[PDB]
Amino acid sequence: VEEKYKKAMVSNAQLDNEKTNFMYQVDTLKDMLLELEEQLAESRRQYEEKNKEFEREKHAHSILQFQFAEVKEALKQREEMLE
Amino acid sequence: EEKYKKAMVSNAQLDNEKTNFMYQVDTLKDMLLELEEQLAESRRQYEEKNKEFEREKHAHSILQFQFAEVKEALKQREEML
């Protein structure tokens, strides 16, 4: 039937166009997904590299606290010995 | 009225393809939300460390000066012995 087949290929156009829109949609989201992955990986590097600096510092700093508390004591004992 | 069979088959196909894309949109949307959550956290974690590292460096300087003074104040009482 002319009219049944008409509506059908008219529907075929409706669908095929709705489909490519959803297609263009998922790909758009897919891109965003990977874009964010890139950013997240960037961010993880930063944190890691800072944390590494912060450790080197906290370590070095901790070595001094030791030597200082050691020399502070000796100093106190030279002032003690004379009085 | 003979290809009308195949127009309907092509139609049901397309409809279904549309549905599968729909589900994809949904789950991608979820993933994305979960992701900026993570990204944001990471960025926040960085910001606290950078602060933490500035604090450390700063304290580490203060000490370095104190040590330098107390080690030179000690040399003048061990060169005396």
Q: What is the DSSP string of chain A?
A: -HHHHHHHHHHHHHHHHHHHHHHHHHHHHHHHHHHHHHHHHHHHHHHHHHHHHHHHHHHHHHHHHHHHHHHHHHHHHHHHHH-
C-alpha B75: how far from its chain's center? 50
CATH number of the CATH domain containing A3:
1.20.5.4090
Chains A, B: CB contacts under 8 A, how many?
115
Contacts of A64 (CB under 8 A, 6+ apart): B60, B63, B64, B67
* Shortest distance, CA A35 to any CA of chain B (angstroms): 10
Query: What are the tokens at B31?
Result: 């993933």
Q: Does A76 touch chain B (CB under 8 A)?
A: no
3-class SS at B76?
A: coil
Rounded-to-integer distance, Cα A52 and Cα B19, Å = 48
List the domain range (segments joined by +) for residue A58: 1-83
In this complex, which of A5, A54, A75 lies closest to B73 when CB atoms are compared? A75
How many domains is chain B built from?
A: 1
Q: How far apart are CA B27 and CA B35, in angstroms?
A: 12
Give the orientation angle of helix B4-75 with respect to helix A2-82, to 10 degrees: 10
